[PDB]
Amino acid sequence: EKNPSLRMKWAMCSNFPLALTKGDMANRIPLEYKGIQLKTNQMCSIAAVTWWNTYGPIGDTEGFERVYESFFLRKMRLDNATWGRITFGPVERVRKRVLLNPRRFLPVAGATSAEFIEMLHCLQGENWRQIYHPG
Amino acid sequence: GIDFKLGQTISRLRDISVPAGFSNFEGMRSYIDNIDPKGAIERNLARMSPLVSVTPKKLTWEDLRPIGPHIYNHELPEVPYNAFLLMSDELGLANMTEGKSKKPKTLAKECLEKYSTLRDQTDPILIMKSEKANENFLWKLWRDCVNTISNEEMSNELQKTNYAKWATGDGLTYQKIMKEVAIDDETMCQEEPKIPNKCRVAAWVQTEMNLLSTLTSKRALDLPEIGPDVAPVEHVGSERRKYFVNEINYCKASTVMMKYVLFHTSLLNESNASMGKYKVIPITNRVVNEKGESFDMLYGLAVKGQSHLRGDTDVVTVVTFEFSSTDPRVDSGKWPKYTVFRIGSLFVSGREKSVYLYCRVNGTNKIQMKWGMEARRCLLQSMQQMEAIVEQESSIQGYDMTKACFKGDRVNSPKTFSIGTQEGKLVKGSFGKALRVIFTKCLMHYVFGNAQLEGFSAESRRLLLLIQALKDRKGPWVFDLEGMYSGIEECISNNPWVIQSAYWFNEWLGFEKEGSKV
Amino acid sequence: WRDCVNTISNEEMSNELQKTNYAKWATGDGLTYQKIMKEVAIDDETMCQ
Amino acid sequence: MNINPYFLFIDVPIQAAISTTFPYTGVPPYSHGTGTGYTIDTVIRTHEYSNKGKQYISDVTGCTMVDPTNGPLPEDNEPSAYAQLDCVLEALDRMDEEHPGLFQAASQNAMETLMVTTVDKLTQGRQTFDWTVCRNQPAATALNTTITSFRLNDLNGADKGGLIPFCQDIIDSLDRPEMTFFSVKNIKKIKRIPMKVKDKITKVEYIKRALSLNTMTKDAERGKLKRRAIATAGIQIRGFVLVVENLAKNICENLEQSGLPVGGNEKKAKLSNAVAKMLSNCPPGGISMTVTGDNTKWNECLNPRIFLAMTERITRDSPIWFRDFCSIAPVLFSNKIARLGKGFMITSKTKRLKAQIPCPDLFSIPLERYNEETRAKLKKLKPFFNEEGTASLSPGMMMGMFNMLSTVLGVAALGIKNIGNKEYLWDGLQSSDDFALFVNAKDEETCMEGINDFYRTCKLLGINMSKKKSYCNETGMFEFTSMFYRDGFVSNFAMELPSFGVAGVNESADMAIGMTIIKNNMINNGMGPATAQTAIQLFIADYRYTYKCHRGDSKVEGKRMKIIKELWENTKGRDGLLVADGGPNIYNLRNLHIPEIVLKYNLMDPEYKGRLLHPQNPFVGIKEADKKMDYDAVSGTHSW
Amino acid sequence: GKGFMITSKTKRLKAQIPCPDLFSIPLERYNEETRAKLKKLKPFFNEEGTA
Ligand SMILES: [Mg+2]
Ligand SMILES: [Mg+2]
């Protein structure tokens, strides 16, 4: 099909649209859960996924943060940041090559460090301006 | 190094693919590499005939003339109603519900159960059949939907499946034969194209514009929540949103838009699930009034017949039976495509009112169903405007003008815009009325959209920008004007919105002319 | 006629015509009316004896 | 009281409300039925603008060719393809003089990229015409099929790495007396099964197949009452086309007038810079006028022969091997062949019969059995018709084939800047078939002469501008690349915001890809906060419906909904639940750049996070989502 | 007997009206002779396809 969304809409309602791997971890999912056919004897149903996050073994998560420091760094930069007032007057933005994350030509009126660019969407505006300080 | 040798065939093509005056590529290559031109353009321009030129003419208010004068001709027929579903004449059987989401088949059965007089009506009182619609076919098909919807089974498949093959006109399809027979057969010839009829303005298009931009007691637009707002930008964005939704939630256009989206969604789900079978697809909606009570509204049933075609542009017959309370005899010229029966009556508020049933055989493709699901972006289109309008005001004065624009403040009167006319006198209206008019205008672009509306809107844009230049005294010039008008006018054939839009453009142009004179 | 001559002249022991699909329309056998349900015909006011 | 929506323009500029004037909420007008007719008008129209050239018979293919280049100068205002070679070279010479060393720098840079380029690059693109099956197949599928068939004919070089040997054999393949390849044969076994078969064709047949362009109808096109034809070429011309487009792109990138390579939010800057510069250069007391331009039949009047000249001029100082390589694509376009649609439909109403006459058998039926428009179309098509169902299309171009090169030609006409040393100076912007022209002169009358001189000057280069679609006014308000400028305010309101729906890959990803598009729209298209906020709401509604993951407090019934509701009660911390797991949506404007998995890590309960983030879970294009766009996502059970 | 046969020339359709349903359609849809025959037969026509 030439539209991924519609192909996905039709795929979602199918009985078993998910492809399941073979292993012991794949055998701990019940064949049927209160009527719903989670799997077949491999093909998988989205209900089987929902069961996994609901009932199943609690896997360990110790190196997840270390693997994903960049994203968690973004989250804490947002959380620890502070917000000022908002200026509604016209703004003058100078086109510059800026770095999105810690490159593209964007209109920026103020700090051009990657910390501000990552949030630029919520700071600049045609007829408004906001003061932001990354954490 | 690199030795990119050329073959015998490629070289021969290169030799013969040279501009006139060169025998081979080598002659062309040498000429470009050595000969230098130092005024070839000037020589040619002098040598060129003077008959070719932009022939520019200054544009003046007198130069501009009404677009499509033929829409005022009274000999042409009134442009008929050709939208997929009734918009302002719609009637929806309301069934108060706690709020639980149920399958459309169960919703239809309960709504029809509440109105047993209409469900059980077996004797049809034909009011008018369009030109060729079979009253017996349409009614027998309709009773099939009611029986199938009200049966105890959980499937919406029509129970006949053989009467429907001919009631829907599916069986009256030409049979394909091998090419050789057709080449031999002398009576087989290509058909002429179906030229669209030229029509004149209709008073029903204006009425829909008037009625569908008004506020109602029912709001059908419910949207998902978003995360908490911790920044001033989020708060002002929420404040602008709250003002926008509050003014568009209860407009009749919003309820109409959701009904179109839900129906085309159900149509597309059935289209993939069902290929060579006939199904009844309730025309339903979910509404909530001011008090917060939720109702299930049934606007009719539709027979989505067969399909048997995978692709983008492949007609799927759809026969729609839609409830309504408007007498087709009041405006005969508006319903020359609908076979409408009088099926009963009801007391909306203690006053008796007839309930007609508009029947019609239609067709649709997969893309139209897909883009029907995508009629909620009219919400995005309508809003992007007031954001700009409110933003522009905020630039003039610091503090947010959302409250001032919509309701006013200490130092600014509420904003007003010209919305319409009465007795030839321009009328003003609040920002809410303009917002609803903008939303309704966007919706009609989707509902009445086709190749004619794309051409008119794109071609008329040039005239609109010319008028803007005239207003600013920029002294616009047009190299030709009749050609520009002809391109715009060629798209005014039978589309209700385009014909009405032409009438509105002429009206606005005259007002601009009078304003210019002063 | 050409199909008949070719069929007769061939070495096969059958008198079957080769181009059956073409012969379906050449003889006019394909132009036969389609029988429908008596109910649909009763409802169709354009069907007359 | 009758509501007139146009009255909103009385109290607002048309540019500000221009968005509502565009019907982008409706169905894009699609093509219904055969596109064979439309392709025929393109051929008739293309030759109608070049019938005054020289008509001869191509010896390589036997087709009837038409060459309007260097032909008689136009006598009327109809479109004309009679571009004068000397004038084109003069414009290029002026172009090179204004940017010394640009042609050399682009040629050297293009070559360096060509040397490093590999065959895998050709797999990037759109549907391509596969000569083996005479159909349309993806670039990767066509490249493999061509590679395998070249092996059969002993043509090697594809395996050799670099694109040069692969492109070398393609030329060599044009000389083989016969070509052997794998063909899909549908044998009836009742069942029909397609198999491979070793098919062989003659040299002339392969030549035609290599030069052929499959033709369909331009569907989903917005803003036109009538459809057109969109063509795609085969693999034989792809590789050569990529290099030439690279060559044109390098030149265009260094041009101030050019706006085609520029993309994103830089378009508004380009519009502002050009108008500011022209106003400053305006003479004291003079008048600066701007022409909102538009070219009609832009592709049907451009000649591949001219592009061959431009490639020669651009590569003036380069090795002959590269000059030959850069001159191949124009050569394969001057001798192109247009495959015509899929035939016509002829019906008998009395017999209730219909049949499809294929293109090879178009003239096997008397013309009296076609309607008037088709009858006239076929009468004019006969001279250029081939017995195999194709039509020879030597003159003109096909839209989208040479876009960068076409812009270079357009910019060259803008660089003339004057004619006859008259008292005016013109400049503008160019992007493919769209242009805007600014003229500065002491008075309006002299400005019109400059526009008229520009109109005539363009006619000499094969560039036709539509008088019907073009208008002029004082500088400060104009339109370019479908963007409206007025008194320093740009109102780009023609791009359609993409349907804010799931990208249809998976749960965690789609949430990541979705939230990325809204953020980009804020940054690039100036999407406001409120409209950005609502775009989030609409997507979430679509996201929950498609994925059957509504809020746990919702009364939706479904297979996964029952499990979602069970999880909602079981989980102590609801705020940590993912949206796909029936969790609340916490996305807002400030947080459109963090994956939801990372967002809810702190709020996620220890059990839920362990289950979702099990290192070895049974359920587990990550970089780019199929145009390639990157999205930030976290691996997890939802990444099935 | 079997009944009559009514056909649509333009639609190229045919259908056999059985004896019980002879009068189920207006007599104007029968040819002249059959129309007169049915008009005369009506008094003696039983509602089962028998006279
Ligand atoms: Mg363009
Ligand atoms: Mg333009």
Residues B436 and B424 sit within 8 Å (Cβ to Cβ): no
The contact set of B with A (CB < 8 A) is 230-233, 236, 268-269, 272, 370, 391-392, 394-395, 397-400
Chains B and C: 3 or more CB pairs within 8 Å of each other: yes
Chain breaks in chain D (C to N over 2.5 A) after: 189, 620, 626
- Containing A57, the helix (H) or strand (E) segment is none
Q: How far is CA B71 from CA B441, B512, B513, in A?
A: 20, 21, 21
Spacing, Cα D297 to ligand 1 middle (Å): 12
Q: Which residues of D touch E13 (CB under 8 A)?
A: none
Q: Which of the 8 DSSP states describes residue D517?
A: H
**Distance from Cα A128 to the centre of ligand 2, integer Å:** 30
Integer Cα distance of B302 and B108 in angstroms? 12
Nearest to C48 among E18, E24, E29 (CB): E29
Which two three-digit tokens encode residue B319?
């026969």
Q: Which helix (H) or strand (E) holds D203?
A: helix D203-211
* D355 vs D358: CA distance, rounded Å: 9
Residue B514: partners with Cβ closer than 8 Å, 6 or more residues away: none
Q: Is D433 annotated as a binding residue?
A: yes
By Cβ distance, the residue of D2, D87, D368 closest to B44 is D87
| Token pair recorded at residue D614 | 């099990």
Cα D457 to middle of ligand 2, angstroms: 19
- Residue C49 has its nearest CB partner, among E10, E12, E34, at E34
Neighbouring chains of A at 3+ CB pairs within 8 Å? B, D
CB atoms under 10 Å from CB of D445, counted, come to 10
Closest approach of E45 to chain C, Cα-based (Å) = 19
- D473's CB contacts (< 8 A; 6+ apart) are B466, B469, B474, B475, B476, B477, D289, D290, D292
Q: Is residue D113 marked as binding?
A: no
Rounded distance from Cα B247 to ligand 2 centre (Å): 36
Which residues are within 8 A (CB) of C28 and not within 5 positions of it... i.e. 6 or more apart? Answer: none
For ligand 2, the distance from its centroid to the CA atom of residue A56, given in whole angstroms, is 61
Chains D and B touch (3+ CB pairs under 8 A): yes
Facing residues of D186 across strands?
A: D194
Handedness of CA D175, D181, D186, D188 (dihedral sign): positive
Q: Cβ separation of C36 and B180 shorter than 8 Å?
A: no
Q: Which of D59, D354, D590 sits opposite B234 (nearest CB)?
A: D590
Helix (H, G, I), strand (E, B) or coil at B451: helix
Resolution in A for the shown PDB structure?
A: 2.9
- Between the alpha carbon of residue D357 and those of residues B175, C23, D284, D363, D624, the distances in Å are 15, 19, 67, 10, 44
D564/A53 Cα distance (integer angstroms): 9
Locate the chain D residue with the closest alpha carbon to E13.
D352
Of the candidates B246, B453, D390, C42, the one whose C-alpha atom is nearest the C-alpha of residue E3 is: C42
**B162/C22 CB distance under 8 A:** no
D98-113 per-residue burial string, b: 16 or more CB within 10 A, e: under 16: eeeebbeebbbbbbee
Question: Quick one: tokens of B190?
Answer: 């290509």
Breaks (C-N over 2.5 A) in chain E follow: none
CA–CA gap between residue B398 and residue D526 (Å, rounded): 20
Long-range contacts of B511-518 (CB under 8 A, 24+ apart): B511/B421, B511/B426, B511/D7, B511/D10, B512/B61, B512/B467, B512/B471, B512/D10, B513/B61, B513/B64, B515/D10, B516/B61, B516/B470, B516/B471
Tokens of B85: 């579903």
The Å distance, Cα D433 to ligand 1 centre, comes to 4
* Residues near C12 by beta carbon (within 8 Å), at least 6 away in sequence: none
D493/D471 Cα distance (integer angstroms): 20
Print the SS3 string covering D355-400. EEECHHHCCCCCHHHCCHHHHHHHHHHHHHECCCCEEECCCCCCCC
3-state secondary structure B72-132: HCCCCCECCCCCCCCCCCECCEEEEECCCCCCHHHHHHHHHHHCHHHHHCCCCEEEECCCC
Task: Sort out which chain D residues have CB atoms less than 8 A from E11's CB and list them.
Answer: 352
For residue B168, the distance in angstroms to the closest alpha carbon of chain D comes to 18
Q: Which residue of C has its CA nearest to E6?
A: C49
Q: Judge whether D544 is annotated as a binding position.
A: no
Q: Which two tokens stand for residue D610?
A: 């362990």
Q: Which ligand is nearest to the CA of D434?
A: 1
Q: How far is E6 from chain D (nearest CA, A)?
A: 18
Chain centre to alpha carbon of residue D17: 28
3-state class (DSSP) for residue B321: strand
Residue D479 Cα to ligand 2 midpoint, Å, equals: 5
Residue D534 structure tokens: 């609502």
D194/B190 Cα distance (integer angstroms): 33
d(CA D308, CA B25) in angstroms, rounded, equals 10
In degrees, to the nearest 5, what angle opens at C-alpha B386 toward C-alphas B383 and B387?
A: 85
CA distance D410 to D388: 37
Burial class (CB in 10 A: 0-12, 13-18, 19+), D540: buried
Task: For residue B376, give the 3-state DSSP assignment.
Answer: coil
Concatenate the DSSP letters of all residues of D222-263 into one string. -S-SS--EEEEEBHHHHHHHHHHHHHHHHHHHT-SSB-SS--
Q: Which residues contact D543 (CB under 8 A, 6 or more apart)?
A: D501, D502, D510, D511, D514, D549, D579
Nearest CA to CA, how far is E13 from chain C (Å)? 5
Pair D82, D68: CB distance under 8 Å: yes
Which candidate, D530, D524, D533, D528, places its Cα nearest to that of D500?
D533
Q: How far is CA C6 from CA B94, C15, C16, in A?
A: 73, 10, 10
D579: helix, strand or coil:
helix
Report residue C48 CA to chain centroid gap: 25
Task: Pick the ligand that lies closest to the CA of residue D430.
Answer: 1
CA of D432 to the centre of ligand 1 (A): 5
Q: Are B479 and B55 in contact (CB under 8 A)?
A: yes
Residues of C with CB under 8 A from a CB of B: 21-22, 25-26, 30, 34, 36-37, 39-40, 43-45
Ligand nearest to the CA of D485: 2
Rounded Cα distance, B29 and B27, in Å? 5
In this structure, are residues C35 and C46 in contact, taking their beta carbons and an 8 Å threshold?
Answer: no
Q: Could you list the beta-strand ranges (E) of D398-514.
A: 424-431, 434-441, 471-474, 477-480, 483-486, 489-490
Q: How far apart are CA D158 and CA E46, in angstroms?
A: 88
Write out the E strands in chain A: 18-19, 32-33, 36-37, 39-40, 43-44, 82-87, 94-98, 104-108, 129-133
A/C touch flag: 3 or more CB pairs below 8 Å: no
Q: Pairing mode, if any, of strands D64-67 and D128-130?
A: unpaired
> Amino acid letter at D481?
T
Q: Burial code of B144-170, b = ≥16 C-beta within 10 A, e = fewer?
A: bbbebbeeeeeebebebeebbbbbbbe
- Amino acid (1-letter code) at residue A114: A
| Closest B-chain CA to D368 | B189
The strand pair at D353-357 and B175-176 is best described as parallel
Distance of alpha carbon A122 from alpha carbon A119, whole angstroms: 6
Rounded to a whole number of angstroms, the distance between the first and last alpha carbons of chain B is 78
Choose among D110, D122, D115, D114: nearest CA to D147: D122
Size of interface B-D (CB pairs under 8 A): 514
Name the 3-class secondary structure at D52. coil
Quick check: A127 contacting B, CB < 8 Å?
A: yes
Q: Indicate the residue of D269, D502, D504 with minimum beta-carbon distance to A95.
A: D269
Strand partners, B90: B324
Cβ contact A–E (≥3 pairs, < 8 Å): no
Contact check, Cβ <8 Å, D589/A121: yes
Closest-CA residue of C relative to B176 is C30
Closest listed ligand to the CA of D407: 1
Residues of D whose CB is below 8 A from A11: 504
D299 has binding-site annotation: yes
Technique used by the depositors: cryo-EM
Compute the distance between CA of residue B352 and CA of residue B361 in angstroms, rounded to an integer.
30
Q: Is D528 annotated as a binding residue?
A: no
Rounded Cα gap, residues B138 and B341, in angstroms = 10
Structure tokens at D395: 């003159």
Is D313 in contact with D79 (CB distance < 8 Å)?
A: no
Cα E6 to chain centroid, rounded: 8
